[PDB]
Amino acid sequence: SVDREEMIERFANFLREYTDEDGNPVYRGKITDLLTITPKRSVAIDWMHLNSFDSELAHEVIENPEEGISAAEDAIQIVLREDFQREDVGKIHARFYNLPETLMVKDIGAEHINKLIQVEGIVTRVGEIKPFVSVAVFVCKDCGHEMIVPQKPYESLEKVKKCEQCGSKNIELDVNKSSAVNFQSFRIQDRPETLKGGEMPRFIDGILLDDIVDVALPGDRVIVTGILRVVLEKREKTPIFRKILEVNHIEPVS
Amino acid sequence: SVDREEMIERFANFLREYTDEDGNPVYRGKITDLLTITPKRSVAIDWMHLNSFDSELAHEVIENPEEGISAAEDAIQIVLREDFQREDVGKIHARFYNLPETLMVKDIGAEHINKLIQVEGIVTRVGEIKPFVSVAVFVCKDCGHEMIVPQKPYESLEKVKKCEQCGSKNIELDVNKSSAVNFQSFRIQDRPETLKGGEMPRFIDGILLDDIVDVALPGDRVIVTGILRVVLEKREKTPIFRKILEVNHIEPVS
Amino acid sequence: SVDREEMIERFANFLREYTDEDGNPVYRGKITDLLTITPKRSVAIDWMHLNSFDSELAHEVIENPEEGISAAEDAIQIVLREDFQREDVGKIHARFYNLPETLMVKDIGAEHINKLIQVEGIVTRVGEIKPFVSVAVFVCKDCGHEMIVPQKPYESLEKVKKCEQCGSKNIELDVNKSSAVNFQSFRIQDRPETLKGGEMPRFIDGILLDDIVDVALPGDRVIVTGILRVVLEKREKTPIFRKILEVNHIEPVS
Amino acid sequence: SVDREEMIERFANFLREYTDEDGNPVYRGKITDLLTITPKRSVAIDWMHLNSFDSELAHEVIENPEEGISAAEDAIQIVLREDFQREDVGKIHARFYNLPETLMVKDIGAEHINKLIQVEGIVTRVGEIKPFVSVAVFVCKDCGHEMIVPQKPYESLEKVKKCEQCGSKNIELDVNKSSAVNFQSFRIQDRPETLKGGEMPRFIDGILLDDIVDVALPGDRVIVTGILRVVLEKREKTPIFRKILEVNHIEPVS
Amino acid sequence: SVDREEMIERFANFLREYTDEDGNPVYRGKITDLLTITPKRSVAIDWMHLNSFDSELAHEVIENPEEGISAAEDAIQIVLREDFQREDVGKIHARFYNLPETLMVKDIGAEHINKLIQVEGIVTRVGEIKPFVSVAVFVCKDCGHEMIVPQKPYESLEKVKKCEQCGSKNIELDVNKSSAVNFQSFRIQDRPETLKGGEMPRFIDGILLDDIVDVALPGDRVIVTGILRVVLEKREKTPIFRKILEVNHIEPVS
Amino acid sequence: SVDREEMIERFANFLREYTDEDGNPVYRGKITDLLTITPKRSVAIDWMHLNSFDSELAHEVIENPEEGISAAEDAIQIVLREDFQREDVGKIHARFYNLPETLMVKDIGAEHINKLIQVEGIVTRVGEIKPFVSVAVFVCKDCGHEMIVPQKPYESLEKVKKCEQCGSKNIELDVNKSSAVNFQSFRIQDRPETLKGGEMPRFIDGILLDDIVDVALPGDRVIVTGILRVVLEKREKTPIFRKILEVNHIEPVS
Ligand SMILES: [Zn+2]
Ligand SMILES: [Zn+2]
Ligand SMILES: [Zn+2]
Ligand SMILES: [Zn+2]
Ligand SMILES: [Zn+2]
Ligand SMILES: [Zn+2]
């Protein structure tokens, strides 16, 4: 694979240098647009673009999407600092779309676990929009020490048992110091027309965070990309994985 | 009974040597077929064939189906290595069919517990297909030690409390290192036509794993063979067994 | 048309005779590159070359790719024996490229079945690289007689029921006498970017054998040439013809 | 076509003379069996048998099933009289099976109206068994005159307005003089497995009379032959035909 | 307006002469195609084409769609006879699409009654496919006289009281002589997204006949053209019109 | 193999030369029967005859039925001109029968595509007898130039977009210059009686042209010979290959 430091470099280079068929510096422009008075909170990257410019890296995104996405976001940040002298920009997401293969929900095997997959389906349900504690901040009631603990929207809350400074077992989550983002669950499944007669359609539950929340309603036909996550299903006696799609990019089909 | 080492021997011998009424070396042929470009993941063995060739062993399959099946699978593996020079073949299941007795669901007594029974019925329900963690791999966050723990689809997840190398109570299940296979629950019961008027039909729940998942729909009339498992029913106050059929082979009736 | 006897000669001419715009015997050159420290197992023949030199034969490899390719491979083999005193080289593929017409996946029709087509597309997925028994040698264990069954990579392993000599059924596959090569499946489709608004992209499955496996990854834009095969579906429920592309030559699009 | 008199002749001849591949006089035997102490109330005729013996007649059965069946039944009657000296035998049905084409329910077009079609499907519903007034006998309360009026199980009761002898408008149906037979409605439709994904299965309602009543339960997979009848659907505003299958023969599939 | 005779003329002329931007004689070609081995049963005409060629006529189609469509169909027939020497072609529908205005369901006012409107909506429901008696044929049981009576899929069956030849009140509908076509009801309504918050969406019921039956499922977004029909709603005490869309052309939106 | 030039000669020999066990020039006889008061439009060539006389050519009509048949029909045509001074006779079909191998419908595989096969089966249904434009002659209305498009009965009417002479798009189909013949579709399947317990019977669709239409009815046991064609499905939703049998000769089973 490719270590983080070097991905950031390669990504930063891609954003700056990539140009399309007509010579348009697509991502330079997208990043420039971040200086507009009401900017976007993400930059969508066409996987095919990245694959034609630095293929080895493009495949790393699919193999290690967590590090891949993270590096890409770190690069956006340094391009904003080095090329636009903007520091206070806040989080900008890297959302990859147009992957080489589109799976049906039924195709999502366990060989995909923790990779970036692209799935086409119809939205069966959407949850209500709630605040997800993306960063929990715990505060000791004795020394007043602060412990930052990032969370994952598919795993249960990672608490702290004792203070990392004064060993005290008197800590609570500080609701104000903690950071919260929008969260919305949804479900997609294969449409019956895509299957054989009397075949039971399969489904998968996803998570939308931040700015891609509330972009789809039930009945919508979508192409999502995301990391396939598995967590142990507590509904079952025996160890069964419950699949969750942590969505990286979502758009309707046409 | 018969110890494992000797079963493997006897099984390997059976697979190589058995020939039917016309002199066809059935199982030699079935195993040869495993070298085709898209092979099966199991070898179905006609219990009657095995009984006519090594009857003592055939009865051992019914008495100790767990060791019996395992030995048969280990034999398949050594026949592939010794006779076909194939090592990387992966798991091939031994699925025994055509047992001497066919039970109705109502006939399944506790004298069958952990034996291989053959049941005829009609499928009342099928579950959704899920990934069952057939092999859990735990990883220590301190020494990075790896512990392999195989699972059973009818028992709850067997965790590990502390590291087996550095005694550390800081281990988690590694979702990527673990192996998962397909899983599907189903229910069969006796058809009313087979019973007396106003008799309440009885049912039993089964498990299908791997490649025999999704081979039956509700309304289907099947003959399954499988190990009868009992686990303590948590629904009841008092100790009651909940029967589960861990399916070894399934086919529709004709 | 041309019978295969005469093709071998006409090809062996072409290989020796053909000279480019500079008077170099290109294909004489390529043939020698098969005698290097580590050689090549293929000779890439430009179709335009064969056309400008023996237009009738060039038109023939398209109408009858199987005999066309086979005859050229026989000519390569006699030019080794006759012009370089080498008959130990083994199988050398003749891979034709730069054909007169280029199809999009959607343009593939019934008129191409068993003809050499050239398809431009993007790779959707690629399979695991596995061994394919390309020539099966069956040995009767009774009389010792050998039987040679050649295989097609798009059909399942074809066997022999009884010994053609002594009628016996006690036969086995001799893995040593048999020939195996690498196999890799892959899928290409038309690039959504070359299609109308909501036009579903057409896809086709390919086969790569021997020295052209592992040549491509998903996302690769390629030009394959190959024989269109139709194969009867394995699923025995009023089955139907699916199409496979047996790849003859594959290079990335320029 | 063929007039009634001549059909009866040809049918009578067929029953007597037909012999199968082994020289068995199948229908002679079936009719002989009618002299057993507890006889059947119908004779099933294999359409293929009749087609091989008197093809012109076999096609007449399908074209005019009402006259065809009737003639066949009249012939059975005269064979019983002329060859077995039995008169008091009662009604014996001619039930033709094994027609040349099997329709799915969705294939039943209006070009079938009043022809003998053969349909395969799954029974969705069965009605309760009721007595159908196959022959209504009306009796004048003035002159005591009796009027016989046969009925059809798909049309409403054909009454009489006035006495055919004394012109009196004082007639009622005589419940005792009238003849009643068993009647049972049922519904078959195509199974989802036979259709495309998300395709709405179509159905048709049938009538079973006399001795073929209560031979099928819901869930059963049947092949029925019958005359397709249409009557004006009163549920609709506009003129729509409601299809009814008046079953001639029914058997489960295998 | 324009009398029938003259419309047919003008239409026939349009079909023969019209050419598009590239000089393609679109409708000449569409009609030529009717001589293929498996032809269509309708010719779709782009209203815009007709408007650019004979605008006065195009507006007549909207004003009097019943005469307009009929004339267009009569013209198709005479073009087939005069230009292709085909008489036995059967009914070919004229289906106009792409009208100048697209109404939402809520826009369908009574000023549209018996005009050709074009509506966009989402299919809420579809009925089961039934045979509609498009032509009832009545037969006198006395003189055997035949009376043809065409029907409309939105009006109740138009019977005949007495024979038009022997004045006899003894006539019945002859189910075999009558002609039946496919029929399917459906409902479309405006999607909530197209309306204001908390606005109750409005709907309309349609009829599909013949070859445009079963071309839409619930959830489909369609653009239909059709004659708006009103019939007196029998559900209400007071005189209220029930709107019905007699569909002339339907296609999904993109 | 054999080029068509040489086939014509080899066939014209066979027709003149071949003599039976009694020394009669059978095919000379059959050719004259084309000059009777009312003649025949076909010459039924027994494959066994052609085989025992010119084994290489006989094997050729099977491998290349289209050129084989075509060449024989050219030879028939020159033997008329040369041996009987007749060149006004018009198309005479060469219909080959009594082929070496007989397939059941289920035995038809991809290896038969575009080869002459012989299938025994029973007729399930037969179509309406309609006209098929076998040769379309297109006349440009601007410059007067004629263009000849030959047709296949298993594809749709192929046309010409613009005049090859003057580039004009003002083209029309000249029905008089064009050739049409009768067409009838039919379906045969294996007889359930030659199949196992619950074995679904396989079916195939055939085409009868010209003088072999109306030759069979449902229920007829027949032996057809013909070219297996695969045609790309008209339904443009990832379409697939269906198989049609273009019938060369058909007779009832003896
Ligand atoms: Zn503290
Ligand atoms: Zn440890
Ligand atoms: Zn031998
Ligand atoms: Zn009276
Ligand atoms: Zn009358
Ligand atoms: Zn011209």
Residue numbers in the entry:
A (entry chain C), B (entry chain D), C (entry chain H), D (entry chain C), E (entry chain D), F (entry chain H): 0 to 253
Can I see the authors' text?
The Minichromosome Maintenance (MCM) complex forms an essential hexameric-ring helicase that unwinds DNA at the replication fork (1–3). Crystal structures of the N-terminal domains of Methanobacterium thermautotrophicus (MtMCMN), Sulfolobus solfataricus (SsoMCMN) and Pyrococcus furiosis (PfMCMN) show a consistent hexameric ring structure with three subdomains: a helical subdomain-A, a Zn-binding subdomain-B and an OB-fold subdomain-C. The crystal structure of PfMCMN bound to single-stranded DNA (ssDNA) revealed that subdomain-C binds ssDNA in the plane of the hexameric ring via conserved residues defined as the MCM single-stranded DNA-binding motif (MSSB).
This phenylalanine aligns in sequence with a phenylalanine of Mcm4 whose mutation, Mcm4(Chaos3), severely disrupts Mcm4:Mcm6 association and has been associated mammary adenocarcinoma. Instead, this structure suggests that the wild-type β-turn can be induced to accommodate either pentameric or hexameric ring structures. The pentameric ring structure of PfMCMN-F179A observed crystallaographically is not maintained in solution under all conditions tested. The PfMCMN-F179A pentamer found in the crystal structure is likely stabilized by crystal-packing interactions, including interactions with the peripheral subunits. We therefore consider a ssDNA-bound monomer of PfMCMN-F179A to be the most likely species detected by EMSA at high concentration. The monomeric preference of PfMCMN-F179A is consistent with the ablation of Mcm4:Mcm6 association in MmMcm4 F345I and also the monomer observed by size-exclusion chromatography for the similarly positioned L189D/D191R double-mutant of SsoMCM.
